[PDB]
Design an enzyme around this catalytic site. Structure first.
Site, PDB file in Angstrom:
ATOM      1  N   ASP A 201      35.031  47.677  35.592  1.00 44.61           N
ATOM      2  CA  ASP A 201      35.070  46.233  35.778  1.00 44.61           C
ATOM      3  C   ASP A 201      36.502  45.774  35.998  1.00 44.61           C
ATOM      4  O   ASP A 201      37.408  46.192  35.272  1.00 44.61           O
ATOM      5  CB  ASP A 201      34.466  45.522  34.570  1.00 44.61           C
ATOM      6  CG  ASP A 201      32.991  45.798  34.431  1.00 44.61           C
ATOM      7  OD1 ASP A 201      32.246  45.473  35.377  1.00 44.61           O
ATOM      8  OD2 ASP A 201      32.579  46.364  33.395  1.00 44.61           O
ATOM      9  N   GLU A 241      32.621  48.527  40.761  1.00 42.04           N
ATOM     10  CA  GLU A 241      31.898  47.281  40.970  1.00 42.04           C
ATOM     11  C   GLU A 241      32.813  46.261  41.634  1.00 42.04           C
ATOM     12  O   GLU A 241      33.966  46.090  41.221  1.00 42.04           O
ATOM     13  CB  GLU A 241      31.368  46.741  39.638  1.00 42.04           C
ATOM     14  CG  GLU A 241      30.592  45.425  39.742  1.00 42.04           C
ATOM     15  CD  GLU A 241      31.500  44.205  39.727  1.00 42.04           C
ATOM     16  OE1 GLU A 241      32.642  44.318  39.228  1.00 42.04           O
ATOM     17  OE2 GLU A 241      31.076  43.139  40.221  1.00 42.04           O
TER      18      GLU A 241
END
Ligand SMILES: [Cl-]
Ligand SMILES: [Mg+2]
Length: 502
Positions: A201, A241
């Site tokens: 992330d 991501e």
């Protein structure tokens, strides 16, 4: 190393009765035999902060209300587990940062955090500001947060710390030795707890270079690969991501272990809304194969993921994107408008907060066609826990919390799971999941065809084969398989009818 099959996306507290053991029981009973893997959303201390798990105070520990690492270890004994690693920043309330506030430059943890002087070494404040303007930031939040440090020593000092997201998230120096130790320590708990997949992330921000936009630099890729290389030696694999223009997903996937396919959610809706699979078939001809596919996530439905970006074009035209957004509002009878923030044009909308089921007007046939398209596209398919049970928009929770994304984050108790798995559309979805789990064709070669209003997605591996044929003129969807010496034909409409009568 990754089991080719359907995965579940869930909060540890919002599916079941509120903790990891309760989720584990569900996967052992009512939801048994469905998932080869589970993405457990951030379960660190605390999971219920302002960003719903993604702003933990202590990333190294499980929230004790949810369980401990042995609960994770137990659940991962038989299924692949995906867990989140926040690589870019730490909490201002963490013990490392509070120590910095107390002891200042005398702190053992001083080099762990990123300050203004770590990146800009000059003294022309006008020049530093011109380079600060080039840094890409998602929100107009503070660029630096000026904390008084050394408050428990005879010397104090105000230090501008780099804070990409909020003033309560301090960017760490992932190039320091302490930064690599901190990240390695979490990876250590992961591999000791039967975690197989790491969703990275905010990794795009993790590397800062004065003069650049500090986003997905070459140096950022080098960091991502060093982090991923360590994860591989520990038996794990990384997922980078990002929500970006589609060519950025392609570029990342060519150098990194995995990406999300964030094009399918809006493209499949658009395909079903317009009965035209041209843009969908184009994407599948070029889409990264090392991906995880979704229809719904724990977030809203990403729109900019298929839109233009600067001079780069989208996967559908601006007109199609505006009509896609508008049709979602119509199908949810305006509920998505209540949960989605205002925007000048829908072509500029980040995300539409709405369940995928309500985006399809709760049309059971179209929804089963949507998930069949997802399963028959390359990559590992992930099913969001809400969409697994055809949960409607949670307007009650939305009114209670006033958080837009809660329309798609319902609290589904064990009791509500037992009721929902009796719905025909859910029974049909579980049969599709089983077909996707047991046919070996998805371990082989892929082909996509779109002629004469008929989309065909084909797989073959060993002697097994599986094909999805969607005839948009006839509005028929059919799966043809070869396996176990059998040839089988499954009409989606006949699938849904069978579960209404039996
Ligand atoms: Cl993959
Ligand atoms: Mg495991």
């Amino acid at each position: 190393s990754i089991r080719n099959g359907v995965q579940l996306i869930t909060y540890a507290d919002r599916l079941g009765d509120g903790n990891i053991e309760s989720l584990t029981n569900l996967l052992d009973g009512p939801l048994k035999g469905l998932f080869k893997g589970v993405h457990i959303l951030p379960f660190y201390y605390p999971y219920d902060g302002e960003d719903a798990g993604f702003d933990p105070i202590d990333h190294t520990t499980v929230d004790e209300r949810l369980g401990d690492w042995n609960n994770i270890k137990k659940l991962g004994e038989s299924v692949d587990i995906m867990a989140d690693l926040i690589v870019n920043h730490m909490s201002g309330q963490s013990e490392a940062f509070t120590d910095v506030l107390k002891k200042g430059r005398e702190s053992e943890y001083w080099p762990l955090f990123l300050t203004k002087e770590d990146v800009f070494s000059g003294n022309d404040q006008a020049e530093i500001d011109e380079q600060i303007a080039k840094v890409f930031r998602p929100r107009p939040t503070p660029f630096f947060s000026d904390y008084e440090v050394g408050i428990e020593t005879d010397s104090t000092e105000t230090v501008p710390f780099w804070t990409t997201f909020t003033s309560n998230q301090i960017d760490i120096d992932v190039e320091s030795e302490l930064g690599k130790e901190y990240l390695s320590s979490i990876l250590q708990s992961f591999t000791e707890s039967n975690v197989d997949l790491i969703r990275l992330d905010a990794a795009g921000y993790a590397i800062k270079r004065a003069g650049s936009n500090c986003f997905m630099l070459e140096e950022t890729f080098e960091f991502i690969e060093a982090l991923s290389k360590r994860a591989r030696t520990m038996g794990m694999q990384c997922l980078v991501e990002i929500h970006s223009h589609y060519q950025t997903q392609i570029d990342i996937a060519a150098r990194c272990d995995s990406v999300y396919d964030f094009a399918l959610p809006p493209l499949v809706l658009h395909t079903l809304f317009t009965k035209d699979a041209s843009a969908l078939a184009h994407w599948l001809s070029i889409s990264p194969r090392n991906c995880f596919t979704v229809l719904d996530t724990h977030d809203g439905i990403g729109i900019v993921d298929v839109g233009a970006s600067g001079d780069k074009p989208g996967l559908i035209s601006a007109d199609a994107i505006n009509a896609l957004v508008e049709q979602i509002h119509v199908n949810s009878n305006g509920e998505s408008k209540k949960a989605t923030g205002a925007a000048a044009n829908n072509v500029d909308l980040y995300q539409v907060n709405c369940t995928y089921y309500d985006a399809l007007g709760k049309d059971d046939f179209a929804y089963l066609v949507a998930r069949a398209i997802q399963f028959f596209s390359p990559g590992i398919p992930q099913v969001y826990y809400g969409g697994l049970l055809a949960a409607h928009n949670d307007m009650e929770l939305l009114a209670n919390t006033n958080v837009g994304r809660d329309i798609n984050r319902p609290y589904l108790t064990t009791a509500m799971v037992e009721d929902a798995i009796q719905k025909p559309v859910v029974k049909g979805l579980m049969q599709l999941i089983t077909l996707r789990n047991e046919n070996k064709a998805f371990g082989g070669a892929f082909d996509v065809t779109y002629t004469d209003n008929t989309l065909v997605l084909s797989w073959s591996n060993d002697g097994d084969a599986a094909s999805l044929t969607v005839d948009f003129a006839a509005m028929d969807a059919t799966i043809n398989t070869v396996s176990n010496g059998e040839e089988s034909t499954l009409s989606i409409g006949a699938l849904l009818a069978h579960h209404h009568h039996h």
